[PDB]
Amino acid sequence: FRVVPSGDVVRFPNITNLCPFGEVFNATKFPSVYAWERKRISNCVADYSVLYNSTSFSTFKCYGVSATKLNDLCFSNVYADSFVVKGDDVRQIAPGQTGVIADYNYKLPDDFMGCVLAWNTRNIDATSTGNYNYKYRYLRHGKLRPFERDISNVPFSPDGKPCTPPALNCYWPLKDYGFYTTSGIGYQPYRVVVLSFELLNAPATVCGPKLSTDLIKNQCVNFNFNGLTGTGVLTPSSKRFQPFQQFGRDVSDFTDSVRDPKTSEILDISPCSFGGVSVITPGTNASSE
Amino acid sequence: SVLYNSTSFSTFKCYGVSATKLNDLCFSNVYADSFVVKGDDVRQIAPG
Amino acid sequence: LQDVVNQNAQALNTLVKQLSSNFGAISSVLNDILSRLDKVEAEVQIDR
Amino acid sequence: LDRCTTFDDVQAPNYTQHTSSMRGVYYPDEIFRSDTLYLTQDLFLPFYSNVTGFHTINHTFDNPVIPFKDGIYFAATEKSNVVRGWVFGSTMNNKSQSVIIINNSTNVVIRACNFELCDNPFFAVSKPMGTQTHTMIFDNAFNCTFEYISDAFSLDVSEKSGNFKHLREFVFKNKDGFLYVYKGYQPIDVVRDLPSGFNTLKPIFKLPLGIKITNFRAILTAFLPAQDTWGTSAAAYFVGY
Ligand SMILES: *[C@@H]1O[C@H](CO[C@@H]2O[C@@H](C)[C@@H](O)[C@@H](O)[C@@H]2O)[C@@H](O[C@@H]2O[C@H](CO)[C@@H](O[C@@H]3O[C@H](CO[C@H]4O[C@H](CO)[C@@H](O)[C@H](O)[C@@H]4O)[C@@H](O)[C@H](O)[C@@H]3O)[C@H](O)[C@H]2NC(C)=O)[C@H](O)[C@H]1NC(C)=O
Ligand SMILES: *[C@@H]1O[C@H](CO[C@@H]2O[C@@H](C)[C@@H](O)[C@@H](O)[C@@H]2O)[C@@H](O[C@@H]2O[C@H](CO)[C@@H](O[C@@H]3O[C@H](CO[C@H]4O[C@H](CO)[C@@H](O)[C@H](O)[C@@H]4O)[C@@H](O)[C@H](O)[C@@H]3O)[C@H](O)[C@H]2NC(C)=O)[C@H](O)[C@H]1NC(C)=O
Ligand SMILES: *[C@@H]1O[C@H](CO[C@@H]2O[C@@H](C)[C@@H](O)[C@@H](O)[C@@H]2O)[C@@H](O[C@@H]2O[C@H](CO)[C@@H](O[C@@H]3O[C@H](CO)[C@@H](O)[C@H](O)[C@@H]3O)[C@H](O)[C@H]2NC(C)=O)[C@H](O)[C@H]1NC(C)=O
Ligand SMILES: *[C@@H]1O[C@H](CO[C@@H]2O[C@@H](C)[C@@H](O)[C@@H](O)[C@@H]2O)[C@@H](O[C@@H]2O[C@H](CO)[C@@H](O[C@@H]3O[C@H](CO)[C@@H](O)[C@H](O)[C@@H]3O)[C@H](O)[C@H]2NC(C)=O)[C@H](O)[C@H]1NC(C)=O
Ligand SMILES: *[C@@H]1O[C@H](CO)[C@@H](O[C@@H]2O[C@H](CO)[C@@H](O[C@@H]3O[C@H](CO)[C@@H](O)[C@H](O)[C@@H]3O)[C@H](O)[C@H]2NC(C)=O)[C@H](O)[C@H]1NC(C)=O
Ligand SMILES: *[C@@H]1O[C@H](CO)[C@@H](O[C@@H]2O[C@H](CO)[C@@H](O[C@@H]3O[C@H](CO)[C@@H](O)[C@H](O)[C@@H]3O)[C@H](O)[C@H]2NC(C)=O)[C@H](O)[C@H]1NC(C)=O
Ligand SMILES: *[C@@H]1O[C@H](CO[C@@H]2O[C@@H](C)[C@@H](O)[C@@H](O)[C@@H]2O)[C@@H](O[C@@H]2O[C@H](CO)[C@@H](O)[C@H](O)[C@H]2NC(C)=O)[C@H](O)[C@H]1NC(C)=O
Ligand SMILES: *[C@@H]1O[C@H](CO[C@@H]2O[C@@H](C)[C@@H](O)[C@@H](O)[C@@H]2O)[C@@H](O[C@@H]2O[C@H](CO)[C@@H](O)[C@H](O)[C@H]2NC(C)=O)[C@H](O)[C@H]1NC(C)=O
Ligand SMILES: *[C@@H]1O[C@H](CO)[C@@H](O[C@@H]2O[C@H](CO)[C@@H](O)[C@H](O)[C@H]2NC(C)=O)[C@H](O)[C@H]1NC(C)=O
Ligand SMILES: *[C@@H]1O[C@H](CO)[C@@H](O[C@@H]2O[C@H](CO)[C@@H](O)[C@H](O)[C@H]2NC(C)=O)[C@H](O)[C@H]1NC(C)=O
Ligand SMILES: CCCCC/C=C\C/C=C\CCCCCCCC(=O)O
Ligand SMILES: *[C@@H]1O[C@H](CO)[C@@H](O)[C@H](O)[C@H]1NC(C)=O
Fold it and tell me: Rounded to an integer, what distance in angstroms lies between the CA atom of residue A204 and that of residue A46?
C-alpha cells in the first residue's frame, strides 16, 4: 500500500548573523604558507551570493559535496585555512599531490571534504622593487602528515645532525618568494582559502539560507532536518539523546530518529508505505471488475 | 626533490600511477621526450 | 519443525540486516547520498 | 620559586606492572543506537593489556618523558587532586610547538605555543595553609597558535587522608591535525592498585592543533611543608597504549 506525502517540513537552527565573509576574504594581512593560519566558523548563515558584487575567484573546487547543493545544507565543524602561494603552486593544493608545497608546507588528507578557493592578488602583494615577506620551507626530513604545521627554524643538514649555518653542508630551511609587479602569471602571488567541514552526522551551527516552517506530525510529509532530506511520518519519541548526538539509526542503517534543531525534542521517523495487497480477478475476457 | 630549489612547473600530470607513490618504485624502460609548443597547445598533450 | 521455523525466520532477518552494506558506495543511506550529491554524481552510488 | 626548580634528592622511579581489564572503551561516533550490537574497527586498548604504573609518595616524584606512539589510555587514582594535566610535544623545549592542558584550580587552560618547558613542572601547595602557592610549568612562551580557557570554578586543593576515592580515565588520540580527548570518572575505595571493571568514556575535546605529538609528560602537585622543602603526598597514575 502506497501513500504519497501531503506536506513540507523544514527545520533549521535559529541563526541571524551572516558569516564573516569580509573578515576572511578581505583581510588586510595573510600569513606565509609554512605558517598557514586556521580559524573557526560558527553560528552564521552561509549566504555566499553576497560575494557576487565584490569578489572573483580563479580557482573554486569542492570535494565530498556538489556545488549545487551547498545552499540546502548545514555544516558541522567549519574551519577556514588561509595562506599565500605562487601562481604555479596553486595546483598543489589538492588531495594526492606532490611537490615542495604539498610535501613540506601544507597537505590535504586523501578523504578530504570541503572546498578550495584561490584568487590573484598582484595589486596588493607585489611591488615594483620586489616583495620578499612571504616564505616557504624547501628542506625537511620526511613529509608532512595531513593538516600538520611546522614553524620551526633550525639549520638543516643532510646527515641529520646538529649544524651551524656558516659550516659546509649547512642550510637555512626557509626560502623567500620574490613577488614583482612585472613577473609572469606563474610567479605572481595568489591568496588561498581552504574550507573544511562535516555533513549530516552531528550538530551544526552553520547553515545556508532557507526558510524554516512549522512541524507537522502524524502525517506523511517531506522533511528536511539540518540538510538531511526525506519522506515519512514524524511522531514524538521516548528516546533520550546525548548533547553530542543529533541523529539516530537502526540495525539497517536507516535514519529513524532526530532531534529538532529549534525545540530540541526527539522525534521518530517512520516510512509512509506499509501493507500487503492482493487482486482477485475472474479473467479479463470474462469481466473487467 | 633536488628540483625544488631551482625549477617550477606549471603543468605536471601522471597517468597509470599515483604521484605520492613515485618515491617508492623502480621504473623499467624510461624515455624522456622533449619539445616546445605554444601556451594554448599544452592542453593537447594528453591521451584522447 | 522448530528447525524449519527458525530457518525461515533467520533468512528474513538476514535479508533485513543486509540493508546496511555499502557495496562499494560512499554510504548505505540513500537519503544522505541524495542530500549531499547532485543527480549525476548520486546516480553512480545509487547504481552500486 | 619563580623559575624552574629541580628537587634536590628524589628517588629513582621503578615503574610498576599491572593489567587493564575491559577498560578504555569509548563512543566511536555521534550516532544514537539502542538495543543492538555494533561491530567496528578503531584504535582501542586491548583487553588485559600490560599497563605501566607511576606513583607519588614520600620522596618519589615520577614524571619522566613517556612516548606517545599511537595514542594512550591514562588513568589516575587519587584522593587529593595531585595530577593536574599534561604537556604533549615532540622535543619538549622551545625548538618546537607544544600543547599544555591543565586545570589550575580555577579554570581549564589549553595553550599551544613554543614553551620553554621546565624539566620539573608542578603546582605548589602549602601543607599547613593548604592553599595553592606557585605555578612553575614554563618560563617563557611565544608564537602562540591556539588558546582556550573555560569558565571559572573552585577546586579543593587541601590534602586528604585515607584510601584512594577517585578514578579519572582519559583516552588521547592524534589524527589529521586533531587531538581527540575522551573522559570518564568512577568512584572507588581501593588501597593501591588499578581497579578492575568496565566504564565507557565520552568525547570532550577535538582540538585543532596541527602539531606533531610523540612524547608527553604529566603535571603533578608538590605539597611543600615550607621553603626549600618539598612534599609529594600520595597518588598514582597508569598508562597503556
Ligand atoms: C554592488 O556594488 C555597487 C558598486 O559599489 C560601489 O563600487 C564598489 C567598487 C565599492 O567602492 C562600493 O563601496 C561602491 O559603492 C553598488 O552600487 C553603488 O551604490 C552606491 C550606494 O548607493 C552608489 O553611490 C551613490 O550613487 C548616486 C550617484 O551615482 C551617480 O554617480 C556615480 C558616479 O559617482 C555613477 O557611477 C552612477 O551611475 C550615478 O550616475 C548617489 O546616490 C550618491 O551620490 C552615491 O554616489 C553608487 O552610484 C552605485 N554604483 C553603481 C555603479 O551603480 C551596489 O549598491 C551594490 N549592490 C548591492 C545589492 O549591494
Ligand atoms: C639553493 O639555492 C640557493 C640559491 O642559489 C643561488 O642562487 C641561484 C639562483 C643560483 O644562482 C645559485 O648558483 C646561487 O648559489 C643556495 O643558497 C646560496 O648558496 C650559495 C653558496 O653557498 C651562497 O653564496 C655564498 O654566500 C655567502 C654570502 O652571502 C651573503 O650575500 C648574499 C648576496 O647575494 C646574500 O644573498 C646572502 O644572504 C648573504 O648575505 C658567502 O659564503 C659567499 O660569498 C657566497 O656568496 C648564497 O649566498 C646562497 N644564497 C642564499 C639566498 O642563501 C642554496 O645553497 C641551495 N640549497 C641547496 C640545498 O643546494
Ligand atoms: C630556548 O631556551 C633555551 C634554554 O633552554 C634550555 O636549553 C635548551 C638547549 C634545552 O636543553 C632546554 O631544555 C633547556 O631548558 C635558551 O637558551 C638561552 O641561551 C642564551 C644564549 O643564547 C643564554 O644566555 C645566557 O644566560 C645566562 C644568564 O644568566 C648567562 O650564561 C649569560 O649571561 C647569557 O645571558 C640563556 O641563559 C639560555 N637560557 C637557558 C640556558 O635557560 C634559548 O635562548 C631559548 N630560545 C629562545 C628563542 O627564547
Ligand atoms: C588560572 O588561569 C587563569 C587563566 O589565565 C591564563 O593562564 C595563566 C596560567 C596565565 O598564563 C594567564 O596569563 C592566562 O591568561 C587565570 O585567570 C586569568 O588570569 C589572568 C592573569 O594571569 C587575567 O588576565 C589579566 O586580567 C586583567 C585585565 O582583565 C589584568 O590583570 C591583566 O591585563 C590581564 O589581562 C585573566 O583575566 C584571568 N581570567 C581569565 C578568564 O582570563 C587564573 O588566575 C588562574 N588561577 C590560578 C589559581 O592560578
Ligand atoms: C617564532 O618566533 C620567532 C622568534 O621570536 C620569530 O622570529 C622573529 O621574528 C621577528 C619578527 O619578524 C624578527 O624581527 C625582525 O627582524 C628583522 C630585522 O632583524 C626585520 O624583519 C624586523 O625589523 C624585525 O626586527 C626576528 O629577527 C625573528 N627572530 C629570530 C630569532 O629569527 C618568528 O617570526 C616566529 N614565527 C612565527 C611563524 O610566528
Ligand atoms: C607492554 O609491553 C610491550 C611489549 O610486550 C611494550 O612495548 C614495547 O615497548 C618498548 C619500549 O618503548 C619498545 O622498544 C622500543 O621501541 C622503539 C623501536 O621499535 C624505540 O623506542 C626503542 O628503540 C625500543 O626498541 C618495544 O618495541 C615494544 N614492543 C612491542 C612488541 O611493541 C609496551 O610498552 C608495554 N606497555 C606499556 C604501557 O609500557
Ligand atoms: C528558536 O526560536 C524559536 C522561535 O522563537 C520565537 O519566534 C521567533 C521568530 C522570534 O520572534 C522569537 O523571539 C520567538 O520567541 C524558539 O521557540 C520559542 O521558545 C520559547 C522559549 O521560552 C517558547 O516560549 C516559545 O513558545 C517558542 N516559540 C514557538 C513559536 O514555538 C526556540 O526556543 C528557539 N530555540 C533556541 C534553541 O534558542
Ligand atoms: C641552467 O643553466 C644555466 C646556464 O646554462 C649553463 O649551465 C649552467 C649550470 C652554468 O654552467 C652556465 O654557465 C651555463 O651556461 C644556469 O644559469 C646560469 O648559471 C651560471 C652558472 O655559472 C650563472 O653564473 C648565471 O648567472 C646563470 N644565469 C641565469 C640567467 O640564471 C642555470 O643556473 C642552470 N640551472 C640549474 C638549475 O642549474
Ligand atoms: C576590503 O576592505 C577595504 C578596507 O576597508 C576596502 O577598501 C576600501 O575601498 C573603498 C572603495 O571601494 C575606498 O574608498 C576605501 O578607502 C577603502 N578602504 C577603506 C578602509 O574604506 C575594500 O573595498 C574591501 N573589499 C571588499 C570586497 O569589500
Ligand atoms: C613512606 O614513608 C612511610 C612513613 O611516612 C613509611 O612507612 C613506614 O615504613 C617503615 C619502614 O618499613 C615502618 O617501620 C613503619 O611502620 C611505617 N610507618 C607507617 C605509618 O606505615 C613507608 O615505608 C615509606 N615507603 C613507602 C613506599 O610508602
Ligand atoms: C630526467 C628524468 C629522470 C627520469 C625520471 C624517472 C621516473 C619517473 C619518476 C619521477 C619523475 C618526477 C618528475 C619531476 C617531479 C617534479 C615535481 C614538482 O616540482 O612539482
Ligand atoms: C622500587 O622497588 C622497591 C622494591 O624492590 C620498592 O620498595 C620501591 O618503592 C620502588 N621504588 C619507588 C620509587 O618506590
Answer: 12
Mutate to test the interface with A, among B4, B6, B9 (most CBs of A within 10 A): B4
Q: What is the stated resolution of the deposited model, in angstroms? A: 2.1
- Of D152, D157, D113, nearest in space to D135 by CA: D157
The burial of C15, by beta-carbon neighbours within 10 Å (0-12 exposed, 13-18 middle, 19 or more buried), is given as: exposed
At a CB cut-off of 8 Å and minimum separation 6, what does A23 contact? none
Nearest to A260 by CA among A211, A232, A206, A223: A223
Query: CB A146 to CB D176 under 8 A?
Result: yes
Q: Which residues of C touch A (CB under 8 A)?
A: 16-17, 19-20, 28-29, 31-32, 34-38, 41
Query: Judged by CB atoms within 8 Å, which residues 227-266 of A form the interface with C?
Result: 227-230, 251-255
Cell digits of residue B14: 601522471
- Do the beta carbons of residue D217 and residue D120 sit within 8 Å? no
Longest dimension (CA), chain A: 105
The cell numbers describing D169, all together, are: 580515565
Interchain CB distance below 8 Å, A138 and B19:
no
> CA A63 to CA D178: how far, in whole Å?
20
Q: Which residues contact D162 (CB under 8 A, 6 or more apart)?
A: D79
Q: Which residues of A touch C16 (CB under 8 A)?
A: 251-252
Quick one: CA dihedral A63, A65, A68, A72, positive or negative? Answer: negative
Q: What is the DSSP letter of A88?
A: G
Query: Is the C-beta atom of D58 inside 6 A of ligand 10?
Result: yes
Q: What is the largest CA-CA distance in chain C?
A: 51
Pocket test for ligand 6, best of D15, D171, D241 (most atoms within 8 A of CB): D241
CA–CA separation, A209 and A73 (whole Å):
9
Task: State the alpha helices, DSSP H only, in A12-63.
Answer: 21-25
| Nearest of A228, A244, A212, A263 to residue A15 by alpha carbon | A212
How many residues are recorded in chain B?
48
Give me the DSSP letters along D42-80: -----TT-EEEEEEEETTEE----EE-TT-EEEEEEESS
A247: cell is 541523529
Q: Whose CA is nearest to atom 1 of ligand 9?
A: A26
Question: Which string of b and e fits A106-127 if b means at least 16 CB within 10 Å?
Answer: bbbbeebbbbbbbbbebeebbe
Handedness of CA D120, D123, D126, D130 (dihedral sign): negative
Q: Name the structure determination technique.
A: cryo-EM
DSSP A228-276: EEEEEEEEE------TT--EEE-TT--EEEEE-TTT--EEEEE-S----
Q: Tell me whether strands D122-126 and D215-224 are parallel, antiparallel or unpaired.
A: parallel
d(CA D161, CA A82): 53
DSSP designation for A131: B
A73: exposed, middle or buried (Cβ count in 10 Å: 0-12, 13-18, 19+): buried
Nearest CB to A253: which of C28, C36, C37? Answer: C28
CA atoms of D202 and D76, how far apart (whole Å): 17
Task: Report whether D180 contacts D205 (CB < 8 A).
Answer: yes
Q: Which residues contact A228 (CB under 8 A, 6 or more apart)?
A: A200, A247, A255, A258, C31, C32, C35
